[PDB]
Amino acid sequence: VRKQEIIKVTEQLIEAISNGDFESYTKMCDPGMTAFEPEALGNLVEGLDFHRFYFENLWSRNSKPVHTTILNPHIHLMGDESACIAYIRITQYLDAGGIPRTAQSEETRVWHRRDGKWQIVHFHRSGAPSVLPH
Amino acid sequence: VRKQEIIKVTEQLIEAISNGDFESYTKMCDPGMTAFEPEALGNLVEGLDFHRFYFENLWSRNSKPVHTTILNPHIHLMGDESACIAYIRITQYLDAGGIPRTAQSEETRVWHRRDGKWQIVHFHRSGAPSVLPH
Amino acid sequence: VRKQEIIKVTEQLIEAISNGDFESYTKMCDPGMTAFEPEALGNLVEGLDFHRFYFENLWSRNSKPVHTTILNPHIHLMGDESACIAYIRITQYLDAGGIPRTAQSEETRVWHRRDGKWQIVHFHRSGAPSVLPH
Amino acid sequence: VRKQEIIKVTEQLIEAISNGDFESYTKMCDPGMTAFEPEALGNLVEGLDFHRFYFENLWSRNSKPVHTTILNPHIHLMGDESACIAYIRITQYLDAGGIPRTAQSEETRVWHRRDGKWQIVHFHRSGAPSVLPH
Amino acid sequence: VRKQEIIKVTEQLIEAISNGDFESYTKMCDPGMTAFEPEALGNLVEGLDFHRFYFENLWSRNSKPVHTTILNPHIHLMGDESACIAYIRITQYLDAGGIPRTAQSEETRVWHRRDGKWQIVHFHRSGAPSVLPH
Amino acid sequence: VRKQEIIKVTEQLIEAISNGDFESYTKMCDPGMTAFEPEALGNLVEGLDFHRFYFENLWSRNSKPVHTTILNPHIHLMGDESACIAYIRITQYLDAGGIPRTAQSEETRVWHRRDGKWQIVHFHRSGAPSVLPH
Amino acid sequence: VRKQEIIKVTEQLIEAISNGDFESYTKMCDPGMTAFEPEALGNLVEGLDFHRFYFENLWSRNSKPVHTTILNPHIHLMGDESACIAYIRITQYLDAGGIPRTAQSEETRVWHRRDGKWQIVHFHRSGAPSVLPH
Amino acid sequence: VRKQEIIKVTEQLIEAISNGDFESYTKMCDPGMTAFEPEALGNLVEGLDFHRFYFENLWSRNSKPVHTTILNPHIHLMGDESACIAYIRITQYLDAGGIPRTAQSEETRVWHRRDGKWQIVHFHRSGAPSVLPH
Amino acid sequence: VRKQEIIKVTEQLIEAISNGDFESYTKMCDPGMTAFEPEALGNLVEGLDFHRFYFENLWSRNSKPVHTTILNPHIHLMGDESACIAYIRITQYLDAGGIPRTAQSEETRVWHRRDGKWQIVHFHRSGAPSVLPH
Amino acid sequence: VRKQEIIKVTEQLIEAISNGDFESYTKMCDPGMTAFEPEALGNLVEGLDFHRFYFENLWSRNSKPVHTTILNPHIHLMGDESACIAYIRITQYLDAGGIPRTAQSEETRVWHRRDGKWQIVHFHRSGAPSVLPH
Amino acid sequence: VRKQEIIKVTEQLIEAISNGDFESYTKMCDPGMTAFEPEALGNLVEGLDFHRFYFENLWSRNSKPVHTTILNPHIHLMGDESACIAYIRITQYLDAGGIPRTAQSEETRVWHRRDGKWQIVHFHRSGAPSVLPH
Amino acid sequence: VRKQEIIKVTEQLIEAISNGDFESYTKMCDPGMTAFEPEALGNLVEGLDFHRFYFENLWSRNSKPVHTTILNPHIHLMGDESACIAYIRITQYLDAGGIPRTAQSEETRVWHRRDGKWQIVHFHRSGAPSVLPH
């Protein structure tokens, strides 16, 4: 019951990221959120300004078929207020010439229940970049 | 006050890992702990059996000079029970020929206050492997 | 007689895959089927959703000449209900510029006779990816 | 109950392979067993003569620490006589200089219950070679 | 108060460089300014003639989206007349095909308060070149 | 006269670094000194603890012939309290086999006259690492 | 006299292959013919179905200038019924941009005089592939 | 019966080559024998002087374990006087450090029954060189 | 006074080379002039015929922006008749796609005052070729 | 006098080759002429048929500017009937994009005075291929 | 008869070179002899001083087994005084570890009958260097 | 007569450099001498201090056989006081394992007759470094 809620909210976040829906993304993310990801080049970025660039330039333009598979999710519940979820992500997309391609990443997300709703406080990503290479 | 406690416990964990003190490491880690790290080759490993190999074969034998610098730690407190810490780690070591070398990693750790003491539930590492290459 | 049936059903499966006939493919595959293949990047995928992407985007569009040769098939019969077949597959195709190309794979397939008809339960592929590279 | 038996026999086979115990290996393997593996260079080898070389020259000499982790096993039962098991394998070993190393493979095994005991009829391996590289 | 002034003037300089506004750039730079940068190929260039080429040919033509993030600025005040600022710079841009890309540089700038206004006397840059590669 | 003083103090600092004289180095460096250098891997390090490792392990052991040439020094004087010096540095050394080798770096140093004596507040280095590679 | 006949029939076969004349090729080849060639990827292919693909897609379309030189032919006559011929083959062709290119192969052919006419039973080719690369 | 004789004589030749028994090799080979092999660098060598070097320097000194597997032999009988045999060859050996290694070759051999005994007239080899690389 | 004359004549020569003005170039060069340059591939070329090709085909056609910086010129005067000048040359240009690029060369020129005017007798160039690569 | 004649005839041959004048080339070449050149791939070709391909396809079509420089010719006269000439050849040409390029070769030519006129009997070329690469 | 003499003298020269017999080599070579060879780096060397280094340092010390095969010699006779010979040379040797190795070269030699004995005037070599690489 | 003097003094300088005779080298070099060479990494070095390192560490220790060939020297005389010489230099040496090696450089030297003796004022070197690589 409690783990299904975390899985559901993570699925909502992933679907919002896929569609370039920056409004929903801003709604589910904490203002002070922190991130490790391949695009930051080893640095820790804070806030949502760093990620708005990719929504504006990549997600809000591209609409080609993309399929996402979430493998072996694991959830840690820390009281009734906070949770952590870690999983593997396989993304199938199409390159410039229209040839199917696949990429893999490992992702961790930390959720806090602020004022009655779940919000990401930190997230760490490894493996393939979010920007899909041809 | 509360962030200093997390910094202190993280420093204790790092120092215990450096010295190959598997007893302290087992004391600070949750039995169900999960890990993402370069050595797992993209897989999520559970338990402490995976890490005991490196204590037995690397940390419990090597004693050459190693210096660790922790850069830009950031801490999220989620109530009074749980916390998350993210930082950059620079490690200076000596290779096989005795030439100084440096490596960088990005690390996240999730702490839960179980039965009055902090314990790692999940951790995610990126960048250089823990096993120092020559 | 019994080995010829397995060879025939494997040929039907291969021909259905070649033509992008997802209906027949779904008919010959078990709902709980598992797969190892180069496209999964070392992971074990379950179900038919992972493979539907390539039918939608590769097999249901491309129609260029493709020739398939099956080398040294070997069949193990396990009672009257189950069988296993292992073979080498050589595929001749045309790249982007229209130059003939060849690729090789090694393939194993496990068939179970459910409710009177054969169905794949597991399959493992090595070598060249199914997505033909230029 | 029935899946635990397959897991147990697979663990016995893996432990026997680790120790270079060619007698047990010959006991659990069918005389007509077939194999796909990286060492065969894309060919299908039959019988146990191909594998005896590595028992004689690698397993029966080397005794350095090796740790094996089996990830996400999946089992298909085909009646009461036959079964198939597919899993990921992580192997931690020591190279020539004594530096810890890790390797990953994907493995499928087909078991038949002949005359009251389980025996491998076919097996397919992908990823790292069994011969551990430095 | 005094560090905020240096941060503000550095932001003005960066924004002027971004827009290809050579007039403002010439206004903020000392005539005898010196520079280390990747484009000089290990040499120390003096004056503003070396940099006018890139304003004429790159900044005064290109207008595609560019986002700049300044990480961990550190400021040294040397009396009331001079200051030094060192920081990391992350630049997000679009390559030839329109794919988002990121680059990192480390930058130091020395400011002198001449005749009541701040002016750059020397600057040293490392990492990615200013000319954004595809 | 005033530029000769800066050149002299820079020569003293370089000679002290060459001889592994950590006492003199600590004497000439400000406690809050900051540094960009290739060994930090793109990060800004503060304090003298990061550099003590190389004095302990490289400069305090090695004593092979090393020759240093300083090319085209340029000096900016900012009042009577602060100065900046930028130059090219050629280092001739011997590798592991005893073969002469040469390396080049570009270096900037910022000096502040605190309590009547010059002290480094910041320094930025590019090109070859200080640790001489074979 | 008898060696000239083998040379003549080999020349006829080569000319028929050059022109994409699959009818003549089928006439000169035994139904059970076997082949080693670079395109088979280390496998032994039997029959003429493997080679029909290249006649259909490469020889029956391309008509650009091609020049063939046969170097140092050697012939072994085994009775009055069978012969073997081994030679070097240099092929001059034009790539995609129209630039002359050259390739070399080593070729062996085994001829049997069945029902009064010579027919290839086996052939082995090394070196450059028949499919001419740009 | 007649194909078994060719298989037997080929096995004798391979075993004689393995043991460095140049006398038997000279006995089974025709004086005018011709050869294509990787060691000749694309040239056709005649006689047995080219191969005597490897018997003198490699086969007559090395005695480490070597295992040979012959895959998918195919035989063409041309009357009662001549035959041709084509097969794949897998060789397992030990490199300089004692690590097991495997190599693959494709081989064709032409036998003529002179004065009542079989003799090689021509042979063509592809793939791995006979000289085993570490 | 005398060094300024050499600097002036060298600037005239460089400007004439930049504009593809072969007449002025021929006027400033001795008929027996010799040259070392990267385009000669390690050979010493004599006369002006070798350089006329690049005037005809490169300088007399291209007119895109090019900026030249001369660094650290050094002049040796040998009596009143002859001089030598050595300097570093940085060239900023635009590649095929219009991206700014930079190149560096080291250049020596020997001037003789024949019949009252200066003329190049020999010149030696190292580093980047004169033909600007994209 | 006698060396000038050889130089003249060599210049005529080179100019005829440059213009794609196969008639003159055939006139100056002996029917039994032999050649070593990079295009033959290490083989010795006899006759003029091998070279006619490049006249037909390269020299008889291309007419872009090409400049040839002959460096350090050396001539050996063997009686009044035969001579040998060896020289270096620098060729300046234009690639596909119109960028000047240079290539170097070393060439030897053997001339025999048959029936009162000089004819090439053998020639050996090293270095760059005659077919000019972009 | 006349071609056999040239073959004999060439064999004598090759055998003398193999044994490091600089006296015989000097006896068979003309004082003004010229050479193209890979060791000269594209230059034409004159005299015997260049080759004496390799006799002193390589041929006069090494005595390991070396086997030479001469393939497809071709001879042009120019009157009764001069001749030219061109051939392929295969050399089998042993590297540093004692592993057999093979190399190929193409060679031309020009002989003049001075004062009643044959002498080399020019020679041109391509392919592998004479100095055998491991 | 006058060119022979320059050749003689250049030979003396080269022989002095070969023997590590720093006294003679200092005697023939001007105090203000300038140099371009590969070891300076694109910089112009002044004085003899830069070159003393290689005399101390390379020439004054190594004594293995080295042979030098000077190809195609060209000399320009500028009055009776100054001269310039340009040539190619081939150096034959022995690497670490004792294998002969060859290197090529292009060199220019400017001589001035000061107080009755010739002295180098400038020299420019291209190609192989003076420090001989294995």
Residue numbers in the entry:
A (entry chain C), B (entry chain J), C (entry chain D), D (entry chain I), E (entry chain B), F (entry chain K), ...: 345 to 478
Quote what the paper states about this structure.
The calcium calmodulin protein kinase II (CaMKII) is a multi-subunit ring assembly with a central hub formed by the association domains. The AD hub, which evolved from bacterial dimeric enzymes, extends the β sheet to form lateral contact interfaces (LCs) needed for ring assembly, while the ancient dimer contact was preserved as the vertical contact interface (VC) in the mirror-symmetric two-stack hub. Linkers with variable length and sequence between isoforms and developmental splice variants, connect each AD with a peripheral kinase domain (KD). Here, we present near-atomic resolution cryogenic electron microscopy (cryo-EM) structures revealing that hubs from the α and β isoforms, either standalone or within an β holoenzyme, coexist as 12 and 14 subunit assemblies.
We expressed and purified a recombinant form of CaMKII comprising the α AD fused to a fluorescent Venus tag, separated by a flexible 15-amino-acid linker. From a single sample, we obtained two cryo-EM structures for the CaMKIIα hub, a dodecamer (12-mer) and a tetradecamer (14-mer), with 6 and 7 ADs in each of the two stacked rings, respectively. The Venus tags were observed as a blurry density around the hub in 2D averages for both 12-mer and 14-mer. The 12-mer and 14-mer hubs were resolved to 2.7 and 2.6 Å, respectively. The 14-mer hub has a 12 Å increase in diameter and a larger central pore compared to the 12-mer hub in negative-stain single particle 2D-class averages of holoenzyme hubs. The superimposed structures of the 12-mers between α-isoform and β-isoform had a root mean square deviation (RMSD) of 0.35 Å, while that for the comparison of the 14-mers between the two isoforms is 0.3 Å.
